[PDB]
User: What shape does this take?
Amino acid sequence: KISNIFEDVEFCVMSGTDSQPKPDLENRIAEFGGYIVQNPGPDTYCVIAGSENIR
Amino acid sequence: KRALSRLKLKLNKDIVISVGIYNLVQKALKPPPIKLYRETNEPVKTKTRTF
Amino acid sequence: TRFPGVAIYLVEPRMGRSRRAFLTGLARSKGFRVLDACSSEATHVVMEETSAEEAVSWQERRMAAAPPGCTPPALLDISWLTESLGAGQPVPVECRHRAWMPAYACQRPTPLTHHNTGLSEALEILAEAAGFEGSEGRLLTFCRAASVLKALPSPVTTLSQLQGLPHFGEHSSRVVQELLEHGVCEEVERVRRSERYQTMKLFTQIFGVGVKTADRWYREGLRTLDDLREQPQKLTQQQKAGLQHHQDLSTPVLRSDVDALQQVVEEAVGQALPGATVTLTGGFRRGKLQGHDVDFLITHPKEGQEAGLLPRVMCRLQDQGLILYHQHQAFERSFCIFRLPQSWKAVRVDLVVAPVSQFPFALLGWTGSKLFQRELRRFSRKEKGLWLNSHGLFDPEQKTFFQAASEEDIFRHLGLEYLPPEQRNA
Amino acid sequence: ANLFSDVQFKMSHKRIMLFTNEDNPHGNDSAKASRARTKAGDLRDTGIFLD
DNA sequence: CTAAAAACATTCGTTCACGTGAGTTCCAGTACAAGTCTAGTC
DNA sequence: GACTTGTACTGGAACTCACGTGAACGAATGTTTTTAG
Ligand SMILES: Nc1ncnc2c1ncn2[C@H]1C[C@H](O)[C@@H](COP(=O)(O)NP(=O)(O)OP(=O)(O)O)O1
Ligand SMILES: [Mg+2]
Ligand SMILES: [Mg+2]
Assistant: This one.
């Protein structure tokens, strides 16, 4: 918990960049005390995606 | 190959033989959908109760 | 609330949120006082699809965080709540709603006197009978069971006090049943009355006669002591000496004889060499008031001095005119038959010489009981992986001895609590 | 063969696929070729089909 | 009066959830065989 | 006799497949009632 900038959030991540793939991004965003959802929902603030795949 | 049922063909009350039933043609159905937890995408047990 | 004297609380783990809400709403509509959260005001708690033990685990964890003096709520099943809702009032509560004895003998002390004399004697008799047949495993297990019974803190009167005890299987449990329920056990009395047991016991009491020789004589037709004396040509020196003084050696040795023997031996040891020390080991060192022989250990404070003490002391004693039989008539061990003044009597005496470095090891090896020594060696080699004998402790991995300057270090380095000799009685 | 033996589920078929473009791998050597023939024969006798 | 816009009623197909009988196989449980039981001296 | 280790056998449960029963939604059609022109 380096800092508190997100507080309560329902971030969704689908496809990260090559330099920092999904495994390196989920914990990175979690470190800010947020919430990770594998799929989007009504509470989800935004969905993070890199390459535009089918999903 | 799998027999649907091993049944008993009775030509009489005493003359009896054993036969097997197979489905050479069967409708192809899409795989059954399953329920997963949205937050972390894991299987969720389904339970039904009556009170 | 319309029922000030009743308070109920629900549990999330198994009941479920939807069922929680439905039951709470129904109970409130029926006037019952349902608590949203656990509090000291709660008087009863309902658990569904859960075992009693877990419920207790649920209560204790909650009680540890509560102020002292609070009356714990009664643990109940969902059946109570359903019945109360059906009847509309709280239904009365009924019954439905509402390290240890180590296997190794080296860890459990065994005082000299116990409260299970009869059972221990019966088990020892069974072990002796089994050994007479050459089955060492049966003798060992029966001796272990007897030792386990000896270490029981309190007398055993009910069968239920035999489940946790190790080395207690079908045969030992059945023997204990026969002993406790009726008295004299059928098997124990049968084996005791067997003439084979009696003749083998009589033969074994003869010095120099073992189980194999006793069995051979049995199969050769010698059914009494007289036949042995009839043909004194197949008896070796040990057997002849034992039979000649059978009566004297049969009588148990008392402590007075032990003190007299020690006083006599001290002079011989001093004459052989000054500055030597003699220690009394064996059963007497454990506090026994009786025995069959006096066990001694001779040592010197210096390292290299202990080279040839035993021959010199033996020769001095022979010049005294007290030795009737000698093992050999360089050595570091000898058992004899002393002629102590009385008239005179024949008493067996055992002498052992060891260096000061190995003194604690020999002292431990000779003080502890046979079964205790066997169990300690097995524990050392199996659990700790170290080889223990009368000379020293050896580590197969690291080829270096683990000697120590005190006997207690042996128990300290084996990861075992220290015991005194009195508590090492099997 | 070790990979085949590692699994525990009953195997109805055991097949090996060789993707290569070397008609004569062990050309310079001869003992290696004979060892290969012996191993192939052992596999065939065991019940493994190589293509 | 008139037709037309809305509302209502019906049947069918697809989806899903649950229950249940039958065939296959995988594995926990059971049974049984073999080894061990202290270490040394003489 | 009691414990430990290793091997072999075997019946029950998990899985799959297939069918039957019941409930729900939407498409397409037909029919009835009500209201503006
Ligand atoms: N088979 C054995 N294995 C290991 N140590 C043994 C042993 N036999 C004896 N010892 C060790 C341990 C023994 O404590 C010590 C004494 O041997 P005894 O004089 O033959 N037996 P005790 O003195 O206990 O009974 P009593 O007073 O009636 O003479 O020697
Ligand atoms: Mg003794
Ligand atoms: Mg002795």
Notes: The pocket of DZ4 (ligand 1) is lined by residues C 282-283, 288, 291-293, 295, 366, 368-370, 373 (CB under 6 Å). Residues 103, 130, 135, 137-142, 144-145, 166-172 of chain C lie near DNA strand F (CB under 10 Å from a C1').
